[PDB]
């Protein structure tokens, strides 16, 4: 763990962030309605768009289509071609805020999680048709993520203090995880490797929890953040967990011992979002930062 500072820049509050898989680019989506795509090696903006006047809380690359997809508090999903800058689709996806967007790794599917208490599946090869609504949660759906080892299933994290895991094509959850994080679930992520059936959740109750999704048990609890924990993720290649919080810090936890290894206060106020490519990137109140670990 030699943490090197690749590229930071100040901006309005960064609510979403994503790495491009083949280009050295980071996408940020801002509370001001702007999105930015930065080449973090050369430190030049590849493209910027004033998408709306409302916060844009969710954004992802869809690399195989040369798109970004974003979702904003104006209720709308929009898709832009990052090479030409042109908007390719623009539709009202939910009658409320869009918190989270996930892209299926091999099929033309996108999920959106909303304050309307639902997750919705859209198919871009079927004219962006609504293919299914997953109803069940009792509060805002804050995060949605496919299972990378089985993307026919996905998890939703919700302020109703639960995580629900669903199968595409089925109306009810495969199971519902009672987190015990009584201030709600802000984020949910899968561990990517096949040796552990692990998921991780972050909460305003200052805890981070690891879950065995076969037995539905809590494997460990990571404590130490001083304020709401906005996200927690497994690193794809390093045996570490990365979290960020409104206490202004990133924390890197040992993924074997579940103990904190490093606490980074990057000086940009509250942390809100995370991406991993050993690059990681995080979005904050006052900008973003791209960090190399090895």
């Amino acid at each position: 763990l030699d943490i090197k500072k690749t590229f930071s820049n100040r901006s309005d509050r960064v609510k979403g962030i994503d790495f491009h898989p083949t280009e050295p680019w980071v996408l940020t989506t801002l509370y001001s309605g702007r999105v930015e795509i930065w080449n973090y090696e050369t430190q030049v903006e590849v493209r910027s768009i004033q998408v709306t006047e409302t916060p844009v809380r969710a954004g992802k690359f869809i690399a195989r289509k040369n798109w970004i997809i974003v979702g904003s508090d104006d209720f709308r999903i929009r898709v832009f071609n990052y090479n030409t800058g042109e908007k390719v689709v623009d539709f009202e996806a939910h009658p409320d805020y869009i918190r989270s967007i996930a892209v299926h790794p091999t099929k033309p599917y996108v999920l959106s999680g909303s304050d309307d208490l639902t997750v919705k599946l859209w198919n871009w090869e079927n004219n962006w048709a609504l293919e299914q609504t997953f109803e069940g949660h009792e509060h805002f759906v804050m995060c949605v993520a496919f299972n990378p080892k089985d993307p026919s299933t996905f998890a939703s994290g919700c302020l109703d203090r639960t995580v629900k895991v669903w199968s595409l094509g089925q109306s009810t959850p495969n199971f519902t995880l009672t987190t015990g994080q009584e201030r709600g679930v802000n984020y949910v992520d899968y561990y990517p490797l096949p040796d552990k059936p692990y998921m991780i959740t972050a909460s305003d109750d200052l805890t981070i929890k690891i879950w065995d999704y076969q037995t539905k048990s809590c494997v460990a609890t990571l404590e130490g953040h001083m304020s709401n924990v906005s996200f927690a993720v497994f690193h794809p290649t390093l045996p570490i967990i990365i979290s960020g919080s409104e206490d202004g810090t990133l924390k890197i936890w040992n993924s074997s011992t579940y103990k904190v290894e490093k606490t980074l206060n990057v000086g940009l106020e509250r942390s809100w979002c995370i991406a991993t490519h050993n690059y990681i990137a995080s979005g904050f109140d006052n900008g973003f930062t791209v960090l190399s670990l090895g």
Binding site: R13, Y31, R99, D115, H139, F140, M142, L159, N186, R270
Partner: peptide, 5 residues
């Protein structure tokens, strides 16, 4: 609302 920031 709840999580507006």
């Amino acid at each position: 609302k709840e999580k507006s920031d």
